[PDB]
Structure 1
């Protein structure tokens, strides 16, 4: 990154003759670490005293949350199909916040068969993924700042809310 200041750009009035200043330390834009899938490597960068910041690049073990009961359990990552904060970001298959990524939902199968007995009330277009294995789930946590991959599962309303999109 470069900057965080209004001095390089124009305001709501249209001004000119900028030529302002050598940029300070507190306009610090670090490089955009597009977090991907790999082996888990988090860079421990420093800022503002001992404010360590976890910059995750190759995180896997996503803690994704069963919605209707709120069961955040551990799984892997496959790939993001739709994220128009950059439509090339899904072409390159990175992993950022608020992305809709696919999960092999085998521990969710284990929890359902463990606290319900039988195997398969829950919606049908996610029951198809209960059968097959890959369910859609959206990342909540920030791997570029907190270094973690947490998320929430897609269950019904939010599922169709994304499936009608793409």
Structure 2
């Protein structure tokens, strides 16, 4: 099958090597698995030394981490929008490591509401469609929450518009072909601005 030896290559002087030996059990290769977003599907493979690996064919969720706060919540993936390697990979909605994706902001918004008592990214006030208020059963919370707000700080202007739409850009930091997991963190700041500048021009 596929071989990963360097014997069949040609030396740096241009000389052509001669036949030495047949292909060996080690130095082998395996068929690549092209991960796509869809309902979950994972296959098992028995690798060297009796261990096992996981070929991921279709995934729909994975862990993504918010940097400054430090929270990781499981959510669903909307689509992939950029990949530094090949453009044809991007649109076909195939997922690998270091792929820029777009994610749903509902779990992060709800956690933000629970941890901090302030609303984040709400321009629906013009519609007043989903206005609702629930009486909060305490008074000790305000000193703690206002202390957190006055100490930690405020979010940068770029990120609230993304939360207003409910979709955020992120970069995959996991190995889908190796571990069968799509993991990453939401990207922000000047590193975000580089991608936004490149994405639409």
The answer to whether TM tops 0.5 is yes
Aligned-pair CA distance for 1:101:
0.5
Which residue of structure 2 lines up, in the alignment, with residue 135 of structure 1? 168
Equivalent residue for 1:156, pick from 189, 195, 198 = 189
Residue pair 2:64, 2:74 contacting (<8 A) in 1 also = yes
Runs of 4+ in 1 over 4 A off after TM superposition: none
In the alignment, the residues of structure 1 paired with residue 119 and residue 79 of structure 2 have an alpha-carbon distance, to the nearest angstrom, of 27
In the alignment, the residues of structure 1 paired with residue 8 and residue 38 of structure 2 have an alpha-carbon distance, to the nearest angstrom, of 37
> 5+ unaligned residues in a row in structure 2: which ranges?
121-153
Q: Compute the TM-score of the two structures, normalised by the length of structure 2.
A: 0.76
Aligned-pair CA distance for 1:95:
0.7
In the alignment, the residues of structure 1 paired with residue 166 and residue 20 of structure 2 have an alpha-carbon distance, to the nearest angstrom, of 57
Number of residue pairs matched by the alignment: 166
In the alignment, the residues of structure 2 paired with residue 108 and residue 42 of structure 1 have an alpha-carbon distance, to the nearest angstrom, of 27
The RMSD of aligned alpha carbons is 1.6
SS class of match (2:65):
strand
Of Structure 1 and Structure 2, the greater helix share is in 2
In the alignment, the residues of structure 1 paired with residue 170 and residue 191 of structure 2 have an alpha-carbon distance, to the nearest angstrom, of 10
Which residue of structure 2 lines up, in the alignment, with residue 26 of structure 1? 26
Query: Whose radius of gyration is greater, 1 or 2?
Result: 2
Which residue of structure 2 lines up, in the alignment, with residue 75 of structure 1? 75
Residue pair 2:100, 2:170 contacting (<8 A) in 1 also = yes
My pick for the range that moved more, 5-14 or 102-111, is: 5-14
Taking a change above 3 Å as real, the CA distance of residues 102 and 20 of structure 1, as seen in their structure-2 partners, is farther
In the alignment, the residues of structure 1 paired with residue 187 and residue 176 of structure 2 have an alpha-carbon distance, to the nearest angstrom, of 20
Deviations 1:62-101 (A, max 9, x none): 1000111221111111222221312211121101001101
Deviations 1:109-155 (A, max 9, x none): 11111101221221222211111111001111111111111101012
Aligned-pair CA distance for 1:47:
0.7
Q: Compute the TM-score of the two structures, normalised by the length of structure 1.
A: 0.91
Aligned-pair CA distance for 1:21:
3.6
